[PDB]
Subunit: 264 residues, 5 copies
C-alpha cells in the first residue's frame, strides 16, 4: 500500500471503544468457573501430555467494523488500553488455601502474569512454537492448532503459521506473534513467570499509546476492519486442596482513527 496524504476537515477522525472478556478456558459467562481456567492437570510424561478441556488460556480477539468510506482507509493513530478489575485481586477471603496453619489470609490470586495486546488493520499473524511438540489438544476440538506435530516446533519452524481469526480458540502456549510479518499490526507483551510470584499491575485512564510506525503511519484497516487482540493472565487461584486455576481479567480499548488517502 502506497500511503498518500491525510484527509482533513470534519468527520476525518473517529474513535472505537470496546472491551474483551478473558479467555482462560471456561469462556461462557453463564456457566461455573467463568473467567478462570478449569483445574490445571500435569502430564505423566511428555508423550502423554494431553491437557483437559478448558484448562488452556487462549487469545481474546475481535474484528470491529469501521464506518464505510486513490481510496480512503482508516488509520489507527493511538490507543488507550487498560486492564479492568485489578482491584478484584484485593480478595483473600475466598475458599482457598491459607497462610499460617489455617489462621492467616487466603492465598490471593498470584503467580504467572502474561499481558499482551495488539491493534492492527488485519488479523494478528501467528508463529507456532511450543515447549512440547507432542502436546495433544484433542480433548477440545474447538482449539485451533496445527494438524501435524514435529520435533522442530520446540524452536522456530516457519512452516507453522496461522492468523488469529477466532476468539477463545488459539492457545497462548503454542502461538505467538510472528515477528517476520505483522507490518500492519502493533503488538506489546510481557511475561513474569515463577510459581507464586506477586502480580504487579497498573491501571489508569491517562496513558495514550501511539500506534504510528517510524514513518508516521499507523495500521491501515483493510476492508474497513480494525483488529484488536489481547491476553491478560494475572495468576492462579489456589483451592483448599491445592488445585489451581488460571485467572484472567478483561481489557478495555479506546482507539483513535483518522482518514488516510492511499494509492489504488
Amino acid at each position: 500500500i502506497e500511503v498518500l496524504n491525510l484527509v482533513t476537515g470534519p468527520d476525518s477522525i473517529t474513535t472505537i471503544e470496546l472491551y474483551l472478556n478473558t479467555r482462560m478456558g471456561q469462556n461462557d459467562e453463564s456457566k461455573d468457573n467463568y473467567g478462570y481456567s478449569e483445574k490445571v492437570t500435569v502430564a505423566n510424561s511428555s508423550d502423554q501430555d494431553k491437557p483437559t478441556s478448558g484448562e488452556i488460556p487462549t487469545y481474546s480477539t475481535a474484528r470491529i467494523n469501521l464506518p464505510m468510506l486513490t481510496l480512503t482507509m482508516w488509520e489507527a493513530v493511538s490507543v488507550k488500553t487498560e486492564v479492568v478489575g485489578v482491584s478484584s485481586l484485593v480478595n483473600v477471603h475466598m475458599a482457598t488455601k491459607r497462610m499460617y496453619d489455617d489462621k492467616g489470609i487466603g492465598f490471593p490470586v498470584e503467580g504467572m502474569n502474561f499481558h499482551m495486546f495488539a491493534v492492527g488493520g488485519e488479523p494478528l499473524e501467528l508463529q507456532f512454537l511450543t515447549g512440547n511438540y507432542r502436546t495433544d489438544y484433542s480433548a477440545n476440538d474447538k482449539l485451533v492448532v496445527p494438524p501435524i506435530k514435529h520435533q522442530s516446533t520446540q524452536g522456530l519452524n516457519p512452516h507453522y503459521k496461522q492468523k488469529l481469526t477466532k476468539d477463545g480458540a488459539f492457545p497462548v502456549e503454542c502461538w505467538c506473534p510472528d515477528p517476520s510479518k505483522n507490518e500492519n499490526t502493533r503488538y506489546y507483551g510481557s511475561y513474569t513467570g515463577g510459581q507464586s510470584t506477586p502480580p504487579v499491575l497498573q491501571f489508569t485512564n491517562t496513558v495514550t499509546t501511539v500506534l504510528l510506525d517510524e514513518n508516521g503511519v499507523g495500521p491501515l484497516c483493510k476492508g474497513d476492519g480494525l483488529y484488536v487482540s489481547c491476553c491478560d493472565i494475572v495468576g492462579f487461584l489456589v483451592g483448599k486442596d491445592g488445585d489451581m486455576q488460571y485467572r484472567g481479567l478483561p481489557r478495555y480499548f479506546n482507539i483513535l482513527l483518522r482518514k488516510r488517502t492511499v494509492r489504488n
Copy 2:
C-alpha cells in the same frame, strides 16, 4: 459541556487541601484497630463466601465544596472550577518501621516482629463528579449481607467474574464500596483522572515512596482538566500497605491516609 476561555487575573486560581483516612474495615476513629480491617476469614466454600463485618477494605471518598462562582445559574455562560494538577502523598509511611508490636516473630521467637507486609494496593482519583465504577469480582456468589452498609449490586450472576456492563455504580459514599468488587469504569470517567497499582503475593515487601515535590497534571490531551459540576470536587483513594500478622497467624489489612493538594482555575463554559 462546551468549554470556552480561561478566566485570567487575580483570584482566578484556588487550591484545595485535604486528607482521607483509610477505610480498611474498622473505620471508627474512637475504637481499637482503627485503620486496620477486622481479622480476615476464609470461606468454607465458594457458595458460602460471606466475609465478616469489617474485614473488607472500601474506597475512601469525599466531595469538597468549592467557592460559589455563578450568582445566576440560568445565564448564558457560567464559570466552573477546572482541576489543573494535584500533589498527593501517602501519609505515615514511617509508621511501618515498627517490628515490636504484638505479632508473629522471626527466628524461633527471638527475632523481630513481622512488619506489616504483603499485598499493596494504591489508587487515587480526582474529578468533577463521582468516580464511575464497574462491578467485577473474583467470586460472583460473594455474600455481603453481614454488613448492610456496604453498597453492592442487589442481584448476583456468573457473568460478573468478567466485565458485564449492566453492573455499574458511582462512588458516592465513603467507607462503603468494596475494592474487591468495584473498579473504575474505563468506558466512562471522562471528567475524572484515576491512577492505580497492585502488587500481590503473600508476604511481599511493601515498596513505598513519599515526597512533597511531585505534581501530577490533571489536564487531558486537549488541555482541559476535570470540570467541577455544581462546584463539587471529588477525591477518592485506597492505600493498602499489607497485613499485620498477629501472634497466632490471624491477619488484618493495614491502610494509610492520603493527602491531596489540588490546584484549580476558573474556566468559562457555555450554559
Copy 3:
C-alpha cells in the same frame, strides 16, 4: 507568607554548606559498643503491653546550620534570605554491608556465610528553611515509650492516632529523640522544606543501595523557589535504615548508616 522577589547577583551571592549526620538507631553514643545499631528488638506480648526497651527504637537525625548573616537593616522595603537551590546527598559506608564474617546466624547448617545485614530499608532526607513539621501516626496507639523518657512523643494516647489526627503534630527540633515509627512529615505544612523518602519492607529483603558523588537534587519548587532560610538557619534531617543484624541466637538489631549533604544556597530578595 513570604513574597519572593529577584535573585541577588554578583560575587558572594552563592554559598555552600557541607555536613554529615550520624545514624540514630538507638545506641546513639559513639563511645559505646553497638554504636549505629539499635539495642535488641523485643516484641510485645499484647497490644496493651507494647513497651519498647530503651534504645531499640530508631529516631530521625537532624541539625540546624548557621548561615552567613545578611540583613543588618530591617527597616528597608526588602530583605535578603538564603535560598537552598540544590543538594548532593549520599549514604556513607554502604560497602560496610559487604561483611558476612560477623557473629551472626549463618547459612547451610552452620557451614555457610553469616547473614548479611538485611531486611527493612527506610531512607529519607529533608532540607528546609525551618524545622521539618511532623504528623503523629502509629501502628499502635497504645505504644508505651516510658522506658526511655528522652523520646519526644505526645503526652496522651488515643485510638484515632492509628490514622491521621491533625491535633497530633510536632516539629523536628532534636536529634536522636523523635521516633520514626510514630512521626512522619506533615504534608499539610512543610511549604518551606523539601523531603524525599522510601520504604522497602519485608523480613529478610535484600537491601538495594546506591552511592555516587555525581547526582544533584534540585530543591526549587514549581515556581523556581527553593527553601528560604528563616533567621539564617538551614535545617537538614534524615534517617537511613539498611536492615537488621541477625545474632547467633536470632536476636536482631536495626543497622543505620550516616548521610552526607552538600547544599548550594543563593541570595534571594524578599518583601519586608
Copy 4:
C-alpha cells in the same frame, strides 16, 4: 582502522536483512526430541573432575549473512562498505512459557500446577561487520569439555582464566559450538560490533520477558557510524536462556528461545 567518508545516495543504496536464530541449549538437532533444551544438567563431584556431559551446556547462536556484493581491491582510492544502521530484534515464543501442564514437578502436594520454566535468564545479542570477538573467562579453569569435541575451547587450561587473561581470545565463527559459560564478548575489541546482554541468576527466579514489534535499536556509535561489513559479511549472534524445565524427579534442563532480527544497512564510502 577504517576512515569513514560520506554516505552513498541514490538507488540500491539501502538494504535490509531479516533472519531468526534458533537456540543452542545443547540438544541442537531440530529432528530430535528435546530440541531447544539442554540435556539433563549434571554436577561435578569436585572441581578437578568437572566434566559436563555432551549436550548439557548452552552455546552462542551465530550466523554470517552475505550482503549484496561490493567492489574490493587494494588500488582504488575509496571503497564502498555496507554500514549497519539499526536493528529490530525480539525473542520469539515468549507465550510458550504459559504452560504448566508439562511432565514436571508440581506445586502443593501433587495437586497444583506443574512448575513453569523458571530460574536463570541470560539474554544477549550482537550485530557487527566481523565475527564477535570473545574473551575466555570461566568459573572453573579445570572444566573438562572433552565429552563433546565439537565445542570450541582453548587447548590449554590455566588458573589465571578464572580472571581476565588477554592471551585467551577467540572469534565467534561457529554456531552451537562456543560455550556461554567460558566465552564472553571481549570489551577491549569489538569496535566494529554492537552487543547488549543481561543476566538474572538465582535458583527459581521468575523470568521477566517482553516482546514487541515497535522498538528500533540504533547501531550507530557516538560518531554516527554503524558496524562496517568487512568482506560484505553481516554477523549476528545471540543467546536467550529463559530458565530450566524441572522434571518429575528434579532433573533439570536449560530452555532457550529463538531470536528474530531485522537489520537496516546503507552504503558508506570509506578510504582505501
Copy 5:
C-alpha cells in the same frame, strides 16, 4: 585548588586509555587455584573474637596509569568520559560446578548467587577513603598486607572523620571497612551499588554501547595531577556454594576505556 581555563583544540588534543582490573576477592594470585574467589568464609563466635582468615576478605582493585607527558598556565589531561563493563558475566551461566544442588541431589548446581557489590571510580588522584565498619573490633591481623587503621574505636561504626585513607594499593584495602569519602573526592567520580540478602539473584548487564560522562556540573572532568589517571573498582557477583555449604565470594574483572582531552589551567 585548580583554576580551569579553555580546552586545547586541534591535532593530538585527545587521547584514550584502555585497561582492565582483575578482581581482588582474596585469593589474588593468578597462578593458584581459587583465583578470583575469596577463601572460604568463616563466622565469628562473638564480636570481640571477629578475626577473618587470611584471604576471605574482598579488597578494592586500583591502578594509576601514566599519561602522555605535557608540560602563566599548564596543560592537564581531563577525563571526559568512560566506557566500563563487567567482563565474564556469561561465566555465571554454569550450574555443573561442584556445588550444592537443587531438588534432592537431582537438580542443577546452585549458580553463583547472593550479595552483589559494584563500584568504579575514575579520578585525577587516588580515591579518598572514609573508614566505616559494621564491627569496630574486627581483627585484621591474620593478613598484615591489608591496610587498616592501627587503632580501633567504638565510633568507627559510624562516620569518624579522623579515620581516612587514600586508595594507593591494589588488593589491600578491605571493602568492608573503607568507602569513598564524600567530603573529598572533588577530582574523582565514583558510582556504586549494593544488593544484599542471602541467595539473591545477581542482576547484571554488559554492553559496549554505554558511555558514562565524567564532566561535573560545571563541564569539568577529573584533572590528572602529575599526568596520573586513577581507576578503582570492586565487582562482587555473589557466592559459590560448595557441596558442604562452604561459601566463597566470586568477583569479576572490569574493563575501562577512558577518553581524555587537553585542558589549560592556571599555574
